[PDB]
Symmetry: D2
Subunit: 461 residues, 4 copies
């Protein structure tokens, strides 16, 4: 005998799966009772979450709106049409000049789909080196030549780097590499770059070597939407993005592409059908329609005046956080920031990023180690989106800087006393009284702000 | 000038923040329960699954593996994913020493492409069931004109195997011959529109004969496999990939199962584990979708319950009872029946195309899909049992479903006989048709007589 | 001090290099005092040899006639123009409809160049299976999937086979394979196929799957020139060939290609520039101009009435050789021949090709073992060109059959007496009195005919 | 109706069988010895080499290796090829335990492509000296527009390294940087128009730093290498390929040298031997050209003689003496001199293109070729010494060659100054020019004053 539908199908999670329920409660507590500085993280809205956990997960709609395999997509079509039109609006794109595909499962699928669409296998791609602040999906092989990223497995990648002494992109060496290598595709955008991007310069480099130009704006997409950084759409052929991170949406991807007539022969752009086809049927199956509904929510939120003020506040919080760190004598790559993150150079203090990351982590401050100047990594990457989504402003971020300051000095006390090597450093973390104290008034600080996505006046813990 | 307070943008429900999208989800909820969903790849998951899926787990970046992550703060994400891995092994009756699983693939297609990337180099030869014979796009597909459609056929070299063109069964002898000429490095079994079980033993013998890896893509029948209601691919395949929705009744996600430990006969062991994981991350994917992994772990504990075993038996019996009902009316099914969750209905002996039947079925809120028949315009429809079984339908309810389909195909012939065979003519019989409208009304009324998982019918906007 | 030019540069080989001189004399003796049945072998003319050993080896002429890199090619241009025009004449080709490139160093470079010209890397090719009578350069991988032929390394090959019971090409299975596999290129021609080729059928198969059709006529090119077999030019897009073998030229290659207007849109053939460019600059360096001069000699000889009678005699000699072998109860694949070779099936006699080949070799009869019916190989391949070039006619070839008959029966005496296994069989070759006798009146038989290329009334031995 | 008797078609000399071709070879023989051949890749081989080349060795099929052939009857072909292999090792002072050679490549380009195929998979990265900087097509070449020209760039992934744009020397620091970004699997050294020796030690250090194999293509300077007159690539390279004509003075053929035995620092040995041989046959070539292998074995014994060592010293000195003569007139050479067999003459400081100088030189039967300068219409000419040294010319004769070139470039400027810089104008100064004709006459008269190898001047038709 089958279970009644009411028993297996309508019964709440807390009763069907106490184990998993309990873990989500604990994870919910972890998220609002520490300090989140991972620059690729954010806290999304309840409305987004409600669309994401919805009956939309039950519909199969392989194809495009108005062009499906299966019937019954009357309402799914309107959800996706609305999501695509809200995506153009949020980024101030004219529909005769730009299209978007909102079906990629995530950022990396959006990148690989775009590659598939405009490149043949083994075509050459250039992307910002991983050690200089780029992303795995822009190409990565090891010094031994092992192809790590699938972009490097199925295409031929060669990275460009930042200037080793200023930490800025080396646009002259980017051009020299592009002219020797002759990539079919140049990627800009990145994950740990703390400055804006000269898209006009990338566009001149691309024209000079005959390359397509793609911007991956996953990290700054929320800043792009609020027109708080340079718009890649002004100069790029294709723009890919995640929809979480600074956009504050669900986990999903988008591919934007130029439509209509080209600039100066006398022909038009060829991207739309190649990109839709690359996503389906080539690479993906049914779209995740609950993601698309949730993203359409996030994109509406991303157009509001409130979101334009959020992105403004993300920048000023990062500035004030770094202004405060340099105030203590600390070193930031490029000496400041123009976006949502700072990159802290710890090599002047004789420390590695691993050490600061491990100790911060013991106080519920989450950062990640990061290579510096294209170089064990010498820095940490610190981002503002997540804590700004909880309503922290400059003074709160200057206070986060104080916690980081306290964290790094305790990291030095341990290194002075126990040894430079990692195994030695670890000895100073076993029952460290001062680490416990910083964890304490870090947790008390984080308890002072609100939290989107769920009511803290409701959590199990 | 002011930032929106957290309560205003962040805690407000979707019904206030986004009334348009709320309205559409509400409308989609009613469509899902006022019609008869017979898409074989469709299901209705549980409210428990949905609650994990829409949760704060979407906020955590956890690239890497449990215990080897890039970022800190994965204390509880690691436990959710480990429990998901161990429940995936338990739900398919696998010893943790012999089998491992990766539960990070975003969907079934990412699961397949990451399995390919793990064990193949670019341009390695793959063999899979022909799309026209019931296979899936991600197993390989190029058109008669040579255009490579599937990514699998773009970055690898694929060559399809087909059903016997007169019986509808997989032609195992022609599979062995193609595999010995072509020498694929990977043979894929499993399919989307195949109505019989799979002879994995025979696939193993072919793979051993030509030196190929053997992978089962069990997406369509994963629920039947977990319930031990169809043949187990784990007994003979090196790798097993799957979706987690469809007959498994979970979220939209994917899993890659892989053998571990000592190989059968020198003294070597299986090398799959590290290559699979590394292929998912860092080669192909970014951060995992931790809300899907939570929803999946929920679905996998549900799939291990005694009711799910009974749901699976019931799915098979509803397909069989629906099929026997159709052949009781003189209809033809490919292979004359079913051994799983779907039946393939050959409409060519009635002079109809699957399009004409699928369109009129749609206008009564009966969702089927047209489908190629016997490896051959598509001349069949595909009909699946999982979705309506999840709503509690049993054999007599699927005989009633066969009744409405019978009425559908009768009205379809009437219209063809009156207006003509061209599609432009056919459409003329679908406007102001009190017989279609009586069937739509009869489908709706029949449909409202059953419960619905995932949400409460007593709470809908419509 | 340098050597005078007269000492190092004009002094004959016999004085500069007695070792190498002596080996060429011995090799010259070997060639006229045994029986040459390797179907890919011939004996070329003295005139050809004189052009081949000439100052033409000293000129660098990368490029095409009238389109060279280096100057000083006034006379080299006329040699190559004349060779290309003599190549079209010898094969009865209209110059507005066919072009030829005579620069490939050999047959295999001519095949790989042609592939390079019309295919992209990893494009699919179908060729006659090696075990069914095809050539390495048409594609070969092992049962373990190791890519042996470069055609299979750099392209994707799939072979078609002969019918396992008639030994004829299976044209129905060729079409079924081509429709599943969808090759960009289908190759016909072969090395051990004893029948003619249905080029009209290959052309219908190629049109049905959208493939280019290339014939590799290396083995039968002399028969094609004398219009004694079916002309591939009638139905093929590209024809490649060696220029030795039955053409009786130097060792070199040629690529023939369709020019002018296509058959039924309204466009023209695209092969000429792609093929010239593939040979140079893509694949080869300077052409071997002494080969081209020698080939131009061979092609003139190939147009003469004498050569048309040679090719007629090559066929009738093979027919009479096989007619005689079947007269003794022996089995030939397809039961006869239409070209220059027969394929002897030795499995009815319980023997392998290795055994007959080794024993024949001990009597200065040269044959090679060969797989039969696409299957240790069960047959030997026996060809008529070489011995026909020495003026042997039917009765002489029937006498060669008698020698083969004597050879196989002695091979059976040894197998009956010593054992089926190879190591056992070898025991019966150590100081075998009867093998010595057959070697004796094989050597006396071969001494009875003339020899082109050098005067036997002049050899050291 | 009758077969031509063997004597008639087979033994008759070329002068009777084919008078046209005989006439053309006779005419080509006179062109070769009435002019001044300065193509750096050109030489005049010996009558002994030619006699082996045009011989009954062309009649033998011998696919495979000595002692492992497909066909029988290779008793003496095996001995010729073994003696060729052992003489190739002896002529380059290689221990048979440390080095092996394959002498079946049909030419230099087949030698290179077979070496690539042996040690690389398709699409592996290769680095070679840029064509514009003096490299060879077979080391990699694609145009600014992306079109892949070289087969090496079609089936592999190439990226060039260049000369320093102001000194003309290989930029070893920029080589190391490119090689660490690109990570080629193979670095190629050697070139066609490079006027200095190679720092193989430094190439080895770069190869070890990035994990690449190191191959020298020594085609241009193989004669100087055998004579130990330039740096030995064998001391630092894994593989060495070469033509056998050019400065080695042999037939047109190729060789692939490869290291054997124990590797320097674990405990492994070199794996090159079998892969190289297998790449030549069966992967890439058919039957070897046994007449070339015989001619080559002749050339290699000649290359081991004391006169060849003196010929090689003399080639270097004639290039140096020609270069010093040109700079004595104010001309410019890339890098200011030569360390080998050629000089690169930069004509841009005279406002001339290499074309204009090469055309007027040609009209006096002085064969040079125009050539790119400093990695940059081509602005130099390339001038080689091997061919004219083989005719016995010494330093004073090459100073006389520099005199005629000086006259050539003076007449070239006069014509540019009178008629103009456009090529259409330039040609106007080449018709009825008693000064060109006096130089052509002076070249011919100077040219006839020296012997000629390969054939007897006392026997020519002209």
């Amino acid at each position: 005998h089958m279970d009644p539908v009411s028993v297996w199908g309508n019964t709440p999670l807390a009763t069907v799966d106490p184990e998993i329920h309990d873990l989500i409660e604990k994870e919910k507590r972890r998220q609002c009772r520490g300090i989140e500085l991972i620059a690729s993280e954010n806290f999304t809205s309840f409305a987004v979450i409600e669309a994401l956990g919805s009956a939309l997960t039950n519909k199969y709609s392989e194809g495009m709106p108005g062009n499906r395999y299966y019937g019954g997509n009357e309402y799914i079509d309107q959800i996706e049409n609305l999501c695509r039109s809200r995506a153009l609006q949020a980024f101030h794109l004219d529909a005769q000049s730009w299209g978007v595909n909102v079906q990629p499962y995530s950022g990396s699928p959006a990148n690989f789909a775009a590659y598939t669409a405009v490149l043949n296998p083994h075509d050459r791609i250039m992307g910002l080196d991983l050690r200089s602040g780029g992303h795995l999906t822009h190409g990565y092989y090891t010094s031994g030549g092992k192809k790590i990223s699938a972009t490097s497995i199925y295409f031929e990648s060669l990275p460009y780097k930042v200037n080793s002494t200023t930490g800025y992109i080396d646009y002259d060496r980017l051009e020299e590499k592009a002219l020797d290598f002759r990539p079919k595709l140049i990627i800009c955008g990145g994950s740990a770059y703390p400055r804006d991007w000269d898209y006009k310069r990338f566009r001149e480099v691309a024209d000079k070597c005959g390359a397509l130009l793609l911007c991956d704006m996953a990290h700054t997409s929320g800043l792009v939407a609020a027109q708080e950084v340079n718009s890649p759409f002004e100069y790029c052929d294709i723009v890919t993005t995640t929809t979480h991170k600074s956009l504050r949406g669900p986990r999903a991807g988008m591919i934007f592409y130029r439509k209509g007539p080209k600039p100066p022969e006398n022909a038009v752009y060829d991207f739309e059908d190649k990109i839709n086809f690359a996503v389906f049927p080539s690479l993906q199956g049914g779209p995740h329609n609950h993601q698309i509904g949730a993203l359409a929510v996030a994109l509406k939120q991303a157009a509001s005046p409130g979101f334009k003020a959020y992105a403004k506040q993300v920048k000023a919080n990062a500035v004030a956080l770094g202004k405060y760190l340099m105030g203590k004598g600390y070193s930031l790559v490029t000496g400041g920031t123009e976006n949502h993150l700072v990159l802290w150079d710890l090599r002047p203090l004789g420390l590695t990023g691993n050490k600061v990351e491990k100790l911060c982590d013991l106080c519920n401050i989450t950062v990640n180690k990061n290579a510096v100047f294209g170089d064990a990594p010498g820095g940490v990457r610190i981002g503002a989106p997540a804590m700004t989504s909880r309503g922290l402003v400059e003074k709160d971020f200057e206070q986060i800087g104080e916690f980081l300051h306290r964290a790094v000095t305790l990291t030095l006390e341990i290194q002075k006393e126990h040894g430079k090597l990692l195994k030695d450093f670890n000895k100073g973390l076993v029952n460290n009284k001062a680490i416990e104290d910083l964890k304490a008034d870090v947790e008390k600080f984080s308890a002072l702000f609100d939290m989107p996505g769920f009511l803290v006046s409701e959590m199990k813990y």
